Design a protein around this ligand. Structure first.
Ligand SMILES: O=C(Oc1c(Br)cc(Br)cc1CNC(=O)c1ccccc1[N+](=O)[O-])c1ccc(Cl)cc1
Ligand SMILES: O=C(Oc1c(Br)cc(Br)cc1CNC(=O)c1ccccc1[N+](=O)[O-])c1ccc(Cl)cc1
Lengths: 165, 163
């Protein structure tokens, strides 16, 4: 089932496969981001997914990589961080959550990625729900499968991003 | 349930909880091994579990970390490597298999560990089974739980081992 990711050729097909797998687990929007070992900026990043273009552009332009609490979490942990104003603290973090919400990305989680060759990144996934309690139930229900998925995505994605011609 | 590891008082309780979780999942033998970022040897290694003393000693004395096919795998991948005939390619690797088997460790898997601060390790677990078919069925039934377990063990073990 996860073998399809390795089987695919090209970032187009790979991203579509990952998006479908995530959708089948109940997540309508995902972002897979991966950096080479000891990256000092985002110039060499591999970023694929179906987050809206407007949000992608805004997050970049507003410098949210330095605000987003899930980013610093990824540098410190292999465990997922669930999206909660709570991981929000500062005024800019308040701004970030408000704007993410406005973009339609309210509930979700970010799974850190730490590759065998020092690759650093995340698979972030948003879930549409009536409320946070329901979102949490949807997410808990698929957490073991998502845990496998994130490592399969890391192993195959690192190859696609940085290695395969 | 997994957070019991990080909520443990220290090394002794952490090891007992880890071994108990594994046992409850159906694995009577486990080994958690973790090295700090960019290790030259095993002088600062954090190694915990209930592998038999005799086998621990033999592996060290034989220098099996240079032969064990799961070790090289861990340096290349985040995915588990199951203990199957195909992973033992050379006679030296076959001899390793036979010695591990003679020690009681025949069926199992090794989960690579790659920490946020460059920690490198493995969580290995062995199941006592009658044959390969029974071993495989059992491991497939628990694999998703084990997959979460290894990351919780890593995050808590790294915090315990190097801080
Ligand atoms: O992919 C990465 O960051 C990015 C990048 Br780039 C662009 C966007 Br747009 C979003 C993210 C990550 N945040 C989220 O997904 C998120 C989190 C909480 C609430 C809402 C959202 N949300 O809706 O965006 C990344 C991962 C690891 C590292 Cl170490 C560095 C960067
Ligand atoms: O913990 C580590 O290795 C060790 C160390 Br030390 C001591 C012993 Br004893 C065993 C291992 C790992 N092999 C196994 O468990 C195994 C695998 C297949 C078949 C049989 C067995 N088996 O029965 O031992 C380690 C992990 C990552 C790195 Cl990068 C380096 C070392």
């Amino acid at each position: 089932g996860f073998l399809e990711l390795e089987r695919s050729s090209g970032k187009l097909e790979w991203s579509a496969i990952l998006q479908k797998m995530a959708s089948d687990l109940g997540f309508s929007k995902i972002l897979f981001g991966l950096l080479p070992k000891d990256s000092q900026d985002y110039e060499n990043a591999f970023i694929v997914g179906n987050y809206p273009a407007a949000w992608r552009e805004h997050y970049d332009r507003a410098g949210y990589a330095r605000v987003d609490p899930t980013v610093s979490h990824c540098t410190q942990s292999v465990l997922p961080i669930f999206w909660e104003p709570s991981i929000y603290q500062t005024r800019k973090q308040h701004e970030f959550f408000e704007e993410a919400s406005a973009a339609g990305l309210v509930y979700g989680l970010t799974m850190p990625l730490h590759g065998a060759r020092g690759e650093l990144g995340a698979l972030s996934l948003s879930v549409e729900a009536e409320n946070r309690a329901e979102a949490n139930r949807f997410m808990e229900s698929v957490l073991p499968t998502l845990w496998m998925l994130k490592d399969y995505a890391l192993q195959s994605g690192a190859g696609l991003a940085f290695e395969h011609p």
